[PDB]
Design a protein around this ligand. Sequence first.
Ligand code: CA
Lengths: 371, 53
Amino acid sequence: CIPKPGCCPNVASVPKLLVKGGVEVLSVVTGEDSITQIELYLNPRMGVNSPDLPTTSNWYTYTYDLQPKGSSPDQPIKENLPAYSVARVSLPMLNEDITCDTLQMWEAISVKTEVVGISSLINVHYWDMKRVHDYGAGIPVSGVNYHMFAIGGEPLDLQGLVLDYQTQYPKTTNGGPITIETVLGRKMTPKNQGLDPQAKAKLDKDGNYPIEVWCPDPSKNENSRYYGSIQTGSQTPTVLQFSNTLTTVLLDENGVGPLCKGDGLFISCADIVGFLFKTSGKMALHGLPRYFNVTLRKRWVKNPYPVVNLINSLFSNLMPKVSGQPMEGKDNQVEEVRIYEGSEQLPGDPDIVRFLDKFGQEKTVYPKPSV
Amino acid sequence: SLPMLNEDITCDTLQMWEAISVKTEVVGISSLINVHYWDMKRVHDYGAGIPVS
Ligand SMILES: [Ca+2]
C-alpha cells in the first residue's frame, strides 16, 4: 500500500522531532545520529546570591553600596564582590565498542545565547534613583559593564589578577569568596598585580570566585570556548542587542567542539549592566540572567588511556601501601640494573656499559677518565 | 556473599546469580502451645494461661 505520488503533494524534509520536555527527558535512549538541544538559564550572582533569605533579599541581582574606604587597607565584604555564575548539566551515558577501543562522547556544536531582561533597564522611576537634575527623571542604569560566557566539557580554568594586593579579602570560612590567598596559602605578593602562574584555580563553585580578582586563563582553557566584553566608565551608556536568529558555532579549527568529560556540560556566565544611582549619591552594581540553547551531538572517540593501565594504577592506590626502604628517587638503594636481549659475539671489555641515546638508538659507551 | 563468575568482554556479556525459587517455613511454631508459663495471665480462675495470640 502506498499513496498516489501524483495525486498527493510533496512537502519539505525537516529534522524529525522525537520528544520535547524537561530535564527528565534526557534519559531517552537515542541513536548514534541523534542531536540534543538544551534550553536553560543562569541567574546572576553579585554578592546577594539568594532571594530565599528573609532579611537581605531585597537586593537580589545587586550589590551593597560601593565606596572607597579612605584609609589603607581595603576590607571589602562578600556583598560587594560580584562573582561568576556556573552550573553543570549531567548528560546520560552512551555506548562503547571496546573491541575497537572506541567510545562515544557528547560534544557541543552551537550555542544560541542572549541576555534576558534587557527591557527592564528603561525603568528610570525607581523611587530612590538620583535625579540627573532638579525636577528631572532618574539616571538610567549605566556605567561599568562586564559580559562573558563560557561553554566547555571541563570547569573553566581561571587566572588570578587583582588591582591591588594591599586589599584584604574576607577569609574562606565554610562559605564566602575564594581569593588568591585561599589558593596559594600566603598573603598576596605584589607579583599578583601582574601575571602570576602560581595564582590559578578551576571554577568549582558558584558566587564564590569574584570577578575583580579572577580572569579566564587563556593557556589552559583549550577544552572550552569563552567570549568576553567590557566597558568602564562613570555613567557611560550601556548598549545591548538581542535576537533569536544569531547563533554561535563552537567547532574548532580542527572540526571538533568541546567534549563533555564525565558526561557533564559545564557553563559559566557573568553580565554586569551598570550602576544604580541612588539619591544618597551611593552606587551599586547590577546584573541580570543569561539564556543558553546549547546544541549537542554524539561523537565517537578513541580511548586515549588504555584500560589496563588504569586498572593497575587504581587498585595499587586502593591496595594497602608498602612503606619499605627507599628503592626509588634521590636515595634509591639500587646500584646497577642490567638488561639483556638476544645473543651477540663476545665483546672484549666485560665491564662494558651501554645505554639508549636521546633518539632511542642503541649506543655503546666509550670509557673516559672519571676526573 | 556469592562467589565471582565468568565474563565475556568481547561479546559484552557476563554471568549473574539468579534466584529462581525459595522454600520457607517458620521455625518454632510448636513452641506456642506452652500454656504453662509462671507469669501467664489465667484465662479464668483455677484455669490455664492465655495462649500466645
Ligand atoms: Ca594550553
